[PDB]
Amino acid sequence: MNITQAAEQAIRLWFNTPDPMQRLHMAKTIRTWIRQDKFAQVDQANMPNCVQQILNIIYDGLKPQPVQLPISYYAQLWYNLLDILRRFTFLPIISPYIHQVVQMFCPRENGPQDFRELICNLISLNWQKDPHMKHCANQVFQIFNCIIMGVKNEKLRTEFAQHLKFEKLVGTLSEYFNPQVHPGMINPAIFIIFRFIISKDTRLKDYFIWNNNPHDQPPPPTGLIIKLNAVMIGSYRLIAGQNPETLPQNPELAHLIQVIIRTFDLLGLLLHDSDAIDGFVRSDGVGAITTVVQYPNNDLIRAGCKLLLQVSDAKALAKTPLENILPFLLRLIEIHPDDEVIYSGTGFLSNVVAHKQHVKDIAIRSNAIFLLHTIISKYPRLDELTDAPKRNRVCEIICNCLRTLNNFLMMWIPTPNTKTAGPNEKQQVCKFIEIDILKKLMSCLSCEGMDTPGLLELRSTILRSFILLLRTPFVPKDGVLNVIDENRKENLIGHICAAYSWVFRQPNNTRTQSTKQQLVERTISLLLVLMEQCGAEKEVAQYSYSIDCPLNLLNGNQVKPTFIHNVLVVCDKILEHCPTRADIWTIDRPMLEGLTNHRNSDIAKAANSLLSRFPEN
């Protein structure tokens, strides 16, 4: 018998030859046949049947034989058969028939006899302790990895995913994340599988996390939140001493680093909503990451910070000890050369300080205000940035910083319902009215900055920053309007005006409408603040020739009472110093005469102050 004939007979005899040692001999032969031939001799139209025969031998070979046999034998039989299977999942010639491989996983008996439960049992952890069987495990992992990374037909992917969703498999996978397992034992393909089965399956996600427990209790020790955090920490304990210089010749170190990254990634995908995110935070996830990103590997730090950003809005972060974490993150932001980290950190910072007084207090005590100035100061103007990704990131970094600052400024501003700022806090805040940063922020308002998706939110946020700085008692107001940029030769008013005019040239879009409106409202609000706070009623009015009549802002369904009042007052103040605009503007006189009889006494009063300014005709 020659190769092909040796295979032919092997296939033919298989299902009538119950002899163990003949089956192994037989299996070795079919394998070597594939190994060499790469199927090219079999007739194309017989291929479905030829593949199906092999697959049925594979499936039959993996079944437990009635006689008592040594583990050593199965390991050898299975290695050959699983190797054929593996090859059936990457071999160009077989790919039209790949759905036949997937079909095999589809259950029939719902018991330990199905193909999938035989495959599943081979990657049980205890097999990694076995000197022979651990190689079959590593092959099954390559098989999953081949199917998952390989098949492009979306309907087939979906079916494969469905076939995998059974108790014994999810149990088997989780067992790798138990606290007593050394993380050296975690095959990387386990991540690949988890990503695959949870992809767009919310209920499975909540099952892994919660284990049918209530979402307000501690996440259970049997669930993944506790398991994955102990894996991060376990791996970190092992790499912590290790010199990162050894990396290129240190596969164990490389492995554990990638375990950490893949664990960050999995946690990212699992924590899909508020309750999941909160659970993570109450299980000390933030401390866990923060501890782990101490290790000087940049891929690791990026992935850690990405996950911190994702969890930064947790209300449970009001309860976590942040006295050590926050200073470390501030320090990391100060020194790390990567813009993705800067972005992630500052993003984390603004969310974490939001609505949390004691958290604001930690940030400020660790010089967060000085740091925000530094991060903003270090970047060039947006118009100096050529590549889009980079400019938009810088734009988001500045936005984050200014959002952080605004959260602080809010505390020292007198409300009807007064906190005092210390000597150091005052002078750090006052760095923001230095001429260079005013110039930078002014440029951001008015640069012919191109397609930058986060520009709208930056511009709205800068206006807010100016509003709060100028409403802040200890901030000097004398010099702000004397700052004239080198490029447009304009002061703050002109840049404010250029942004306002810009918002109206922008495309209409329900996604952005909310922010455009808040930018318009803040423009009006900042024009008033400048008028009152800088003693600049005249100059604000005359430097505002570039904007059309603000009254026309009320030509819609605008109900916000504070906005209406601001529009009316700013208009009246403008006509006090530039009377002729009253004849140049084109207003809805009925509407204005309407507002004279408004429920609000302030609106009604200002409306007929303004009406008196207009030509009777």
UniProtKB/Swiss-Prot annotation:
Q: Which GO annotations describe the biological process of this protein? A: embryo development ending in birth or egg hatching; embryonic digestive tract development; endodermal cell fate commitment; female gonad development; gonad development; gonad morphogenesis; male gonad development; mesodermal cell fate specification
| Broad class of the protein's primary localization | nucleus
User: Which Gene Ontology cellular-component terms appear in the entry?
Assistant: cell cortex; centrosome; cytoplasm; kinetochore; nucleus
Compartment(s) where it occurs, according to its Swiss-Prot or TrEMBL record: Nucleus; Cytoplasm; Cytoplasmic granule; Cytoplasm, Cytoskeleton, Microtubule organizing center, Centrosome
Entry GO MF terms: RNA polymerase II-specific DNA-binding transcription factor binding; scaffold protein binding; transcription coactivator activity
Task: Describe the inactivation phenotype.
Answer: RNAi-mediated knockdown reduces the difference in the relative level of expression of helix-loop-helix protein hlh-2 in the SMDD/AIY neuroblast by comparison with the SIAD/SIBV neuroblast. Low level of ectopic expression of tbx-35 in the E lineage. Ectopic expression of irx-1 in several posterior sublineages of ABp. Loss of ref-2 repression in several posterior sisters of the normally expressing embryonic sublineages. Guts are missing in about 3-10% of embryos, but this increases to 100% in transcription factor skn-1 or Nemo-like kinase lit-1 mutant backgrounds.
- Give the recorded effect for K360A: Abolishes interactions with pop-1
Organism superkingdom: Eukaryota
Going by the UniProt record, its keywords in alphabetical order are:
Centromere, Chromosome, Cytoplasm, Cytoskeleton, Kinetochore, Nucleus, Transcription, Transcription regulation, Wnt signaling pathway
Something else known: Exhibits low sequence similarity to canonical beta-catenins but displays functional and structural similarities so that it appears to be a highly divergent beta-catenin.
Summary of subunit composition and partner proteins: Interacts with TCF transcription factor pop-1 (via N-terminal region); interaction is direct.
Q: What's its job?
A: Transcription coregulator. Part of the Wnt signaling asymmetry pathway, probably acting downstream of putative frizzled ligand mom-2, Wnt/frizzled receptors lin-17 and mom-5, and dishevelled homolog dsh-2. Activates or represses target gene expression, depending on upstream Wnt signals and interactions with transcription factors, such as pop-1. Required for the activation of Wnt-responsive genes in the E blastomere; thereby leading to a role in endoderm specification and gut development.
Q: What is this protein called?
A: Beta-catenin homolog sys-1
Q: Which gene encodes it?
A: sys-1
Q: Which residues of the full protein are shown?
A: 180 to 798 of 811
